[PDB]
Amino acid sequence: EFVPPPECPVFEPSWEEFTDPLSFIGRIRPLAEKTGICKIRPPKDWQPPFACEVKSFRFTPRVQRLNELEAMTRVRLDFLDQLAKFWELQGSTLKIPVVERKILDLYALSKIVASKGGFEMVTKEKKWSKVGSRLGYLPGKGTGSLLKSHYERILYPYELFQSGVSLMGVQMYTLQSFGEMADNFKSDYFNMPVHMVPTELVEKEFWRLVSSIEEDVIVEYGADISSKDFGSGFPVKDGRRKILPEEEEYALSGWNLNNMPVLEQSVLAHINVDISGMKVPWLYVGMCFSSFCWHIEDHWSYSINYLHWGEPKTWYGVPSHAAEQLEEVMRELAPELFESQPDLLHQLVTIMNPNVLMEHGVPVYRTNQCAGEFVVTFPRAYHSGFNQGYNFAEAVNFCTADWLPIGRQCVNHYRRLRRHCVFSHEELIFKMAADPECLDVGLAAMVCKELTLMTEEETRLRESVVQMGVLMSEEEVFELVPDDERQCSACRTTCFLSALTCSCNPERLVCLYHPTDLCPCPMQKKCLRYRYPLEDLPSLLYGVKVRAQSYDTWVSVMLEDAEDRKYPENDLFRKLR
């Protein structure tokens, strides 16, 4: 019944192309940009050793119930739709909480609580921890008593409402032991050896199982695992280990996912002044039918994923230009609601069968990922997938010159939502502008083109606020304050260039796009806490316009200045020798 989408493109680069990835990825950008994803086969000689010891490697597994893996059931969406219209009636503007790194499933919660008599019944029996069990929350961190706090605040009033009249008050594992499980589970499922079952067949059953209520299937996986804490699958020179010379080659490779975000073409190469969690690889131990839902990268960055070993990983990709198109259809399932909760769209995981997205007009490609193959993902490329069997993957985000203007657009879209930013785009660019040397030229040229657009937009904002009647201007240094203190009250953007603070509260800030929502205290008072007093326009644009127009002139001892100034040497140095 299932309809395999058209396969995504592959690249078998020569050893000479394989030497600078971000330069090799730039080549294939105009082409892969249109499939969203792209597979990459390295030379067959390229076989790095696995640095980790399977037999002594423990991880905490997460569970997946493919039936309730889709969160966008009709019943859940309408449930939430009703719950909000209830609180809008009561004038509270429903707030969805977060628990153990992710949103709470209120539908699931209310269903269960009522399955055992409700709030006061459960309270007078102390089964809140049994609740967190069935909701997949890891004990014994106190989740039980935490849900009670959220239920009573959000659901018990609806419980009474949804109930009779009832309203008077009140209100306001080891990898080794893991393969043994999977390779037994797979075979006993299809009754075959695991390396013998075709891919196309498993793809069929997976999508079958999701929507099949006729049978329930449980599967385990392990994801979002830090390399820092568990170790990478690649060899790296960090003092943990005497490094063999056999491995020396692969430890310095730029295709070692521990070296990517540091390359002179990456953005984070010299800005090791703000940790993000996105300059450090992650580990994804996979099992048959283990699935990840449709998603994009924080700040719309590239993703790159290597499959160290194991059975294949099935992908599904969607190009960038079809992103707004992609979101529109998932939103069609509850328009009234996603108006109230725009970002709740993304807070909800979903595996929308591609056929549907295809029969709604959305480009969908796919590939099977195999041991030793890279999968590269592009900005705003929604992607999903599952794994054919036991395997082990390692993934990293990264950012390139072409990404800069997109990140700027992503904030503007994060600001038009209520979404926190993992770092300040604007902050980043100036950190790059503060060391124009040792900085790849393509960035410089793009930065300038990007930075003037910001100065104008900022100066426009700097003048739009004084008419509103402010007089004082303190100077503050944001890069040294924690993000949670430099965010706007309702944006909620990480502010770095300029914000507005009054004496109404000690530390309560707002973005210059929402200067009114700070506090009713009139703009008569202060304060425009700024960072640079518009003497920056000359200074910093100079250092970068220099190396941006020093290379523009250099082309039109010359082979020496390109050595000292650290210029690229692909086609232009070829004429040298």
User: Which residues would be at the binding site for ligand 90V (CB under 6 A)?
Assistant: 221, 223, 282, 284, 286, 290, 292, 297, 303, 305, 313, 383, 385, 387, 393, 395-397
Nearer to Zn ion, 318 or 421 (CB): 421
Q: Which of 107, 109, 100, 98 is nearest to 137 (CA)?
A: 100
Nearer to ligand 90V, 123 or 276 (CB): 276
Residue 316: CB minimum distance to ligand 90V, A: 10
The answer to whether 514 contacts Zn ion (rule: CB under 5 A) is: yes
Q: Which does 393 bind (CB under 5 to 8 A by kind): Ni ion, Zn ion, ligand 90V, none?
A: ligand 90V
Residue 144: CB minimum distance to Ni ion, A: 32
Side-chain half-sphere exposure of 553, counting CA atoms within 13 A? 7
Q: Which does 504 bind (CB under 5 to 8 A by kind): Zn ion, Ni ion, ligand 90V, none?
A: Zn ion
Residues annotated in the binding site for 2-oxoglutarate, as ranges?
Answer: 221, 303, 305, 313
Residue 467: CB minimum distance to Zn ion, A: 19
The answer to whether 121 contacts Zn ion (rule: CB under 5 A) is: no
**Rounded CA gap, 573 and 577, in Å?**
7
Q: Which does 10 bind (CB under 5 to 8 A by kind): Ni ion, ligand 90V, Zn ion, none?
A: none
Q: Give the CA distances from residue 125 to residues 117, 128, 145, 443, in Å, rounded to whole numbers and listed in that order.
A: 10, 8, 12, 62
The answer to whether 376 contacts Zn ion (rule: CB under 5 A) is: no
Q: Which does 369 bind (CB under 5 to 8 A by kind): Ni ion, Zn ion, ligand 90V, none?
A: none
**Rounded CA gap, 399 and 303, in Å?**
9
**Rounded CA gap, 106 and 337, in Å?**
15
Binding mask 56-95 for Zn ion (x = CB under 5 A): ----------------------------------------
The answer to whether 511 contacts Zn ion (rule: CB under 5 A) is: yes
Residue 454: CB minimum distance to Ni ion, A: 28
Q: Which does 470 bind (CB under 5 to 8 A by kind): Zn ion, ligand 90V, Ni ion, none?
A: none
Residue 513: CB minimum distance to Zn ion, A: 6
Q: Contact region for Zn ion (CB under 5 A) — 19-27, 148-156, 284-292, 505-513? A: 505-513
Tell me which residues in 191-220 interact with Zn ion (CB under 5 A): none
Residues annotated in the binding site for Fe cation, as ranges?
Answer: 295, 297, 383
What phi and psi values does residue 122 have, to the nearest 5 degrees? -60, -40
Nearer to ligand 90V, 223 or 541 (CB): 223
What phi and psi values does residue 190 have, to the nearest 5 degrees? -90, -10
Q: Which does 511 bind (CB under 5 to 8 A by kind): ligand 90V, Zn ion, Ni ion, none?
A: Zn ion
Name the residues that contact Ni ion, by CB under 5 A. Answer: 303
Q: 394 near 306, Cβ under 8 Å?
A: yes
Tell me which residues in 464-503 interact with Zn ion (CB under 5 A): 488, 491, 493, 502-503
CA angle 330, 332, 336 (to 5 degrees): 115
Alpha helix (H) residue ranges in 52-165 = 74-90, 106-115, 119-123, 128-134, 143-150, 156-162
Which tokens sit at 41?
Answer: 């086969």
Buried b (16+ CB within 10 A) or exposed e, 200-222: eebbebbbebbeeeeeebebbbb
Residue 256: CB minimum distance to ligand 90V, A: 15
Q: Which of 336, 349, 341 is nearest to 419 (CA)?
A: 341
Nearer to Ni ion, 303 or 320 (CB): 303
Other CB atoms closer than 10 Å to residue 57's CB: what's the count?
17
Residues annotated in the binding site, as ranges?
Answer: 221, 295, 297, 303, 305, 313, 383
Distance of CA 441 to the CA centre of its chain: 28
What's the full length of the chain, in residues? 577
Other CB atoms closer than 10 Å to residue 72's CB: what's the count?
15
What phi and psi values does residue 562 have, to the nearest 5 degrees? -70, -20
The answer to whether 521 contacts Zn ion (rule: CB under 5 A) is: yes
Nearer to Zn ion, 272 or 412 (CB): 412
Q: Is 317 helix (H, G, I), strand (E, B) or coil?
A: strand
Residue 369: CB minimum distance to ligand 90V, A: 9
**Rounded CA gap, 120 and 104, in Å?**
20
Residue 269: CB minimum distance to ligand 90V, A: 18
Q: 565 near 548, Cβ under 8 Å?
A: no
Nearer to ligand 90V, 265 or 301 (CB): 301
**Rounded CA gap, 276 and 287, in Å?**
29
Residue 387: CB minimum distance to ligand 90V, A: 5
Residue 482: CB minimum distance to Zn ion, A: 17
Sheet of strand 365-369, all strands in order from the earlier edge strand to the far edge: 291-295, 383-387, 313-317, 365-369
Nearer to ligand 90V, 388 or 493 (CB): 388
Binding site for Zn ion (CB under 5 A): 488, 491, 493, 502-504, 511, 514, 519, 521
